[PDB]
Design a protein around this motif. Structure first.
Motif, PDB file in Angstrom:
ATOM      1  N   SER A  67       0.825  -1.219   0.000  1.00 22.41           N
ATOM      2  CA  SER A  67       0.000   0.000   0.000  1.00 22.41           C
ATOM      3  C   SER A  67       0.864   1.277   0.000  1.00 22.41           C
ATOM      4  CB  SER A  67      -0.851   0.005   1.270  1.00 22.41           C
ATOM      5  OG  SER A  67      -1.620   1.200   1.380  1.00 22.41           O
ATOM      6  N   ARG A  68       0.373   2.334  -0.651  1.00 20.28           N
ATOM      7  CA  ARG A  68       1.025   3.635  -0.576  1.00 20.28           C
ATOM      8  C   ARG A  68       0.907   4.166   0.839  1.00 20.28           C
ATOM      9  NH1 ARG A  68      -2.722   6.266  -4.290  1.00 20.28           N
ATOM     10  NH2 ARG A  68      -1.963   7.998  -2.975  1.00 20.28           N
ATOM     11  N   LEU A  69      -0.037   3.621   1.607  1.00 20.49           N
ATOM     12  CA  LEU A  69      -0.216   4.035   3.008  1.00 20.49           C
ATOM     13  C   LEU A  69       0.893   3.544   3.934  1.00 20.49           C
ATOM     14  CD1 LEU A  69      -4.037   3.529   3.883  1.00 20.49           C
ATOM     15  CD2 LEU A  69      -2.848   5.694   3.626  1.00 20.49           C
ATOM     16  N   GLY A  70       1.507   2.417   3.590  1.00 13.80           N
ATOM     17  CA  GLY A  70       2.527   1.835   4.468  1.00 13.80           C
ATOM     18  C   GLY A  70       2.711   0.364   4.142  1.00 13.80           C
ATOM     19  N   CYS A  71       3.782  -0.210   4.676  1.00 12.29           N
ATOM     20  CA  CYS A  71       4.086  -1.607   4.408  1.00 12.29           C
ATOM     21  C   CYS A  71       3.122  -2.569   5.124  1.00 12.29           C
ATOM     22  CB  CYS A  71       5.543  -1.885   4.773  1.00 12.29           C
ATOM     23  SG  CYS A  71       6.602  -0.997   3.604  1.00 12.29           S
ATOM     24  N   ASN A  72       3.114  -2.526   6.456  1.00 13.32           N
ATOM     25  CA  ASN A  72       2.223  -3.352   7.279  1.00 13.32           C
ATOM     26  C   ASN A  72       0.924  -2.608   7.572  1.00 13.32           C
ATOM     27  OD1 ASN A  72       4.133  -1.747   8.822  1.00 13.32           O
ATOM     28  ND2 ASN A  72       3.039  -2.497  10.627  1.00 13.32           N
ATOM     29  N   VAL A  73      -0.057  -2.822   6.706  1.00 14.56           N
ATOM     30  CA  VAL A  73      -1.360  -2.183   6.812  1.00 14.56           C
ATOM     31  C   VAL A  73      -2.396  -3.278   6.824  1.00 14.56           C
ATOM     32  CG1 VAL A  73      -3.030  -0.637   5.681  1.00 14.56           C
ATOM     33  CG2 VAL A  73      -0.594  -0.065   5.671  1.00 14.56           C
ATOM     34  N   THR A  74      -3.297  -3.260   7.833  1.00 14.35           N
ATOM     35  CA  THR A  74      -4.300  -4.324   7.953  1.00 14.35           C
ATOM     36  C   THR A  74      -5.191  -4.312   6.723  1.00 14.35           C
ATOM     37  OG1 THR A  74      -4.320  -3.943  10.352  1.00 14.35           O
ATOM     38  CG2 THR A  74      -6.074  -5.303   9.460  1.00 14.35           C
ATOM     39  N   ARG A  75      -5.405  -5.506   6.166  1.00 14.75           N
ATOM     40  CA  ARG A  75      -6.217  -5.728   4.950  1.00 14.75           C
ATOM     41  C   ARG A  75      -5.584  -5.156   3.684  1.00 14.75           C
ATOM     42  NH1 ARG A  75     -12.554  -6.813   6.136  1.00 14.75           N
ATOM     43  NH2 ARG A  75     -12.272  -7.704   8.231  1.00 14.75           N
ATOM     44  N   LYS A  76      -4.277  -4.861   3.746  1.00 15.90           N
ATOM     45  CA  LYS A  76      -3.499  -4.590   2.530  1.00 15.90           C
ATOM     46  C   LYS A  76      -2.326  -5.558   2.530  1.00 15.90           C
ATOM     47  CE  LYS A  76      -5.951  -1.193   0.778  1.00 15.90           C
ATOM     48  NZ  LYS A  76      -7.160  -1.570   1.623  1.00 15.90           N
ATOM     49  N   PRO A  77      -2.634  -6.828   2.286  1.00 14.81           N
ATOM     50  CA  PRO A  77      -1.557  -7.822   2.265  1.00 14.81           C
ATOM     51  C   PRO A  77      -0.518  -7.464   1.220  1.00 14.81           C
ATOM     52  CG  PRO A  77      -3.565  -8.679   1.232  1.00 14.81           C
ATOM     53  CD  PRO A  77      -3.959  -7.416   1.980  1.00 14.81           C
ATOM     54  N   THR A  78       0.707  -7.945   1.434  1.00 13.06           N
ATOM     55  CA  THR A  78       1.735  -7.774   0.421  1.00 13.06           C
ATOM     56  C   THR A  78       1.298  -8.491  -0.860  1.00 13.06           C
ATOM     57  OG1 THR A  78       3.323  -7.689   2.248  1.00 13.06           O
ATOM     58  CG2 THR A  78       4.223  -8.063  -0.014  1.00 13.06           C
ATOM     59  N   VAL A  79       1.593  -7.868  -1.996  1.00 13.55           N
ATOM     60  CA  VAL A  79       1.163  -8.432  -3.277  1.00 13.55           C
ATOM     61  C   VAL A  79       2.385  -8.871  -4.067  1.00 13.55           C
ATOM     62  CG1 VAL A  79      -0.235  -8.080  -5.361  1.00 13.55           C
ATOM     63  CG2 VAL A  79      -0.893  -7.015  -3.205  1.00 13.55           C
TER      64      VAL A  79
END
Ligand SMILES: [Ca+2]
Lengths: 6, 240
Positions: free
Chosen positions: B210-222
């Protein structure tokens, strides 16, 4: 989407 | 890798460090997976810049002599022909690097096993991300190779509205998203290793967070889904 990369 | 633990020296012998020349030194920029003695699989976006690249195999600590490293120039870069730097979300984030010399295999240097073409992992499959990427959002690279346990999030869930929505494609694998552990800048191009029938195989090439940050809940690494590219990979190696 932020590529990671570095 | 955010929320990782230090990997053992011989756990992930197909992991490579992709580095670029920077003054009189070399800087780590991305990971990769050794797939032949003279070929590395990495992310296309890692090699968009017109830089001089080398690959280090048998690497553990970026900042100290491990006694196991082999250093080799990159002789040819073959990016997926559908890759578009302006559109990471479209997919095709994969490239193959032909090394100037064939490296020597040992306990620290092994070929990564790729999944069979078309294989899709069940939701919540056990995988590990590895790399030297940032250990915090807007942090610094790891000195020693890190691993983090990142279970897959299947396409249906990953492409749902509270996760990645339309940004994720079926040519990608999502993993993690717990808000604690994740890939982060500098891990791009490296492996997602998933345990299948008793054997770890490299199912993903780290692509984006995510552009929001690396470890962001419900934005798993892709990750680019390696099993979507087996024919492409074989074709490139065969013609080069
Ligand atoms: Ca070292």
């Amino acid at each position: 989407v932020e590529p990671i990369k570095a | 890798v955010v929320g990782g633990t230090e990997a053992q020296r011989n756990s992930w012998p197909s992991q490579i460090s992709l580095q670029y020349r920077s003054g009189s030194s070399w800087a780590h920029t991305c990971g990769g997976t050794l797939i032949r003695q003279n070929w590395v699989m990495t992310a296309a976006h890692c090699v968009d810049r017109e830089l001089t690249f080398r690959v280090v195999v048998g690497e553990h600590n970026l900042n100290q002599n491990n006694g196991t490293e082999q250093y080799v120039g990159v002789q040819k870069i073959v990016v997926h022909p559908y890759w578009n730097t302006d559109d990471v979300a479209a997919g095709y984030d994969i490239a193959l690097l032909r090394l100037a010399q064939s490296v020597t295999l040992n306990s620290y240097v092994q070929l990564g096993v790729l999944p069979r073409a078309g294989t899709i992992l069940a939701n919540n499959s056990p995988c590990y991300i590895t790399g030297w990427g940032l250990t915090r959002t807007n942090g610094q690279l790891a000195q020693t190779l890190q691993q983090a346990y990142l279970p897959t999030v299947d396409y249906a869930i990953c492409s749902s509205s509270s996760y990645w929505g339309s940004t994720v494609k079926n040519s990608m694998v999502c993993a993690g998203g717990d808000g604690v552990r994740s890939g982060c800048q500098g891990d791009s191009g490296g492996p997602l290793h998933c345990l299948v029938n008793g054997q770890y195989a490299v199912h993903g090439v780290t692509s984006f967070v995510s552009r929001l940050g690396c470890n962001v809940t419900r934005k798993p690494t892709v990750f680019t889904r390696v099993s979507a590219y087996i024919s492409w990979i074989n074709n490139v190696i065969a013609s080069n």
